[PDB]
Scaffold this motif. Structure first.
Motif, short mmCIF file in Angstrom:
data_model
loop_
_atom_site.label_atom_id
_atom_site.label_comp_id
_atom_site.label_asym_id
_atom_site.label_seq_id
_atom_site.Cartn_x
_atom_site.Cartn_y
_atom_site.Cartn_z
N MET A 1 6.22 38.14 4.74
CA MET A 1 7.48 37.49 5.21
C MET A 1 8.65 38.46 5.05
SD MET A 1 9.26 33.98 3.79
CE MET A 1 11.03 33.89 3.52
N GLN A 2 9.30 38.78 6.17
CA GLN A 2 10.47 39.66 6.16
C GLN A 2 11.74 38.85 6.38
OE1 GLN A 2 10.56 42.56 9.48
NE2 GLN A 2 9.54 41.03 10.78
N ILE A 3 12.79 39.21 5.65
CA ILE A 3 14.12 38.64 5.86
C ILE A 3 15.13 39.76 6.03
CG2 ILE A 3 13.59 36.54 4.57
CD1 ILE A 3 15.18 37.69 2.21
N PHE A 4 16.25 39.45 6.67
CA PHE A 4 17.30 40.43 6.94
C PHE A 4 18.51 40.19 6.03
CE2 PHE A 4 14.94 39.59 10.89
CZ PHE A 4 14.42 40.85 11.13
N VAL A 5 19.16 41.28 5.63
CA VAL A 5 20.35 41.21 4.79
C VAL A 5 21.44 42.11 5.36
CG1 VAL A 5 21.33 41.60 2.51
CG2 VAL A 5 18.99 40.72 2.73
N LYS A 6 22.63 41.55 5.57
CA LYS A 6 23.75 42.33 6.08
C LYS A 6 25.08 41.87 5.50
CE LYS A 6 24.36 39.65 10.35
NZ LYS A 6 24.51 39.86 11.82
N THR A 7 26.09 42.72 5.61
CA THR A 7 27.45 42.39 5.18
C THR A 7 28.12 41.50 6.21
OG1 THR A 7 28.21 44.48 6.15
CG2 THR A 7 27.76 44.48 3.79
N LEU A 8 29.32 41.01 5.89
CA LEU A 8 30.08 40.17 6.81
C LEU A 8 30.49 40.94 8.07
CD1 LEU A 8 32.39 38.40 4.19
CD2 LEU A 8 30.38 37.43 5.35
N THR A 9 30.66 40.21 9.17
CA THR A 9 30.99 40.83 10.46
C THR A 9 32.25 41.69 10.37
OG1 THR A 9 30.08 38.84 11.52
CG2 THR A 9 31.24 40.41 12.94
N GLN A 10 33.31 41.15 9.76
CA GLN A 10 34.58 41.88 9.64
C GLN A 10 34.47 43.17 8.82
OE1 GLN A 10 33.96 38.81 8.44
NE2 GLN A 10 35.03 38.40 6.50
N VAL A 11 33.58 43.18 7.83
CA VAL A 11 33.31 44.39 7.05
C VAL A 11 32.61 45.44 7.92
CG1 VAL A 11 32.07 45.36 5.09
CG2 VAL A 11 33.20 43.14 4.87
N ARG A 12 31.58 45.01 8.64
CA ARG A 12 30.87 45.88 9.58
C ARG A 12 31.75 46.37 10.73
NH1 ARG A 12 28.13 42.67 11.74
NH2 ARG A 12 27.38 41.12 10.22
N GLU A 13 32.64 45.50 11.21
CA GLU A 13 33.54 45.86 12.30
C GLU A 13 34.42 47.05 11.90
OE1 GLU A 13 32.87 44.19 14.95
OE2 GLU A 13 34.41 44.80 16.38
N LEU A 14 34.87 47.08 10.65
CA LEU A 14 35.74 48.14 10.15
C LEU A 14 34.96 49.39 9.74
CD1 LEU A 14 38.46 49.30 9.38
CD2 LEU A 14 38.41 47.93 7.29
N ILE A 68 14.81 29.17 3.45
CA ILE A 68 14.92 30.50 4.03
C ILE A 68 13.53 30.94 4.47
CG2 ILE A 68 15.49 32.92 3.62
CD1 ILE A 68 17.52 31.87 1.50
N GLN A 69 13.34 31.10 5.77
CA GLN A 69 12.03 31.37 6.36
C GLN A 69 11.94 32.79 6.89
OE1 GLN A 69 11.56 28.54 9.64
NE2 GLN A 69 13.61 29.08 10.38
N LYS A 70 10.79 33.10 7.50
CA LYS A 70 10.57 34.38 8.18
C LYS A 70 11.70 34.72 9.15
CE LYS A 70 6.98 33.90 11.13
NZ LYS A 70 5.58 33.48 11.47
N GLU A 71 12.15 35.97 9.11
CA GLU A 71 13.21 36.49 9.99
C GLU A 71 14.58 35.82 9.79
OE1 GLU A 71 10.34 35.73 13.14
OE2 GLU A 71 10.84 37.67 14.03
N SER A 72 14.79 35.18 8.65
CA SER A 72 16.10 34.63 8.31
C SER A 72 17.05 35.77 7.98
CB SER A 72 16.02 33.67 7.11
OG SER A 72 15.42 32.44 7.46
N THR A 73 18.34 35.53 8.20
CA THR A 73 19.37 36.50 7.86
C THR A 73 20.23 35.95 6.73
OG1 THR A 73 19.46 37.30 10.15
CG2 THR A 73 21.31 37.86 8.72
#
Length: 82
Positions: A1-14, A68-73
């Motif tokens: 089972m893989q899940i995704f992790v990322k920062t907030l959109t506004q953080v990535r935008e900058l 939180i399932q497979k391919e959840s972010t």
């Protein structure tokens, strides 16, 4: 089972950055997940907070508790301890 992790959109935008993929299990606790992030990125779990569907996740609970399932972010944010 893989899940995704990322920062907030506004953080990535900058400042940009990547989405991290974690190999997890349904029974993994949130503290397990933060340690996997630590192993990947070096970020101390104490200063990590994870968010799913707008709500903050607590360390003792498992991924399955939050459905939180497979391919959840999940979104990762900083919390300074002081």
């Amino acid at each position: 089972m893989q899940i995704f992790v990322k920062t907030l959109t506004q953080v990535r935008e900058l400042v940009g950055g990547k989405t991290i993929t974690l190999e997890v299990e349904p029974s993994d606790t949130i503290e397990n997940v933060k340690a996997k992030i630590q192993d990947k990125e070096g970020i101390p779990p104490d200063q990590q907070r994870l968010i799913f569907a707008g709500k903050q996740l607590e360390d003792g609970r498992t991924l399955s508790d939050y459905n939180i399932q497979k391919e959840s972010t999940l979104h990762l944010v900083l919390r300074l301890r002081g």
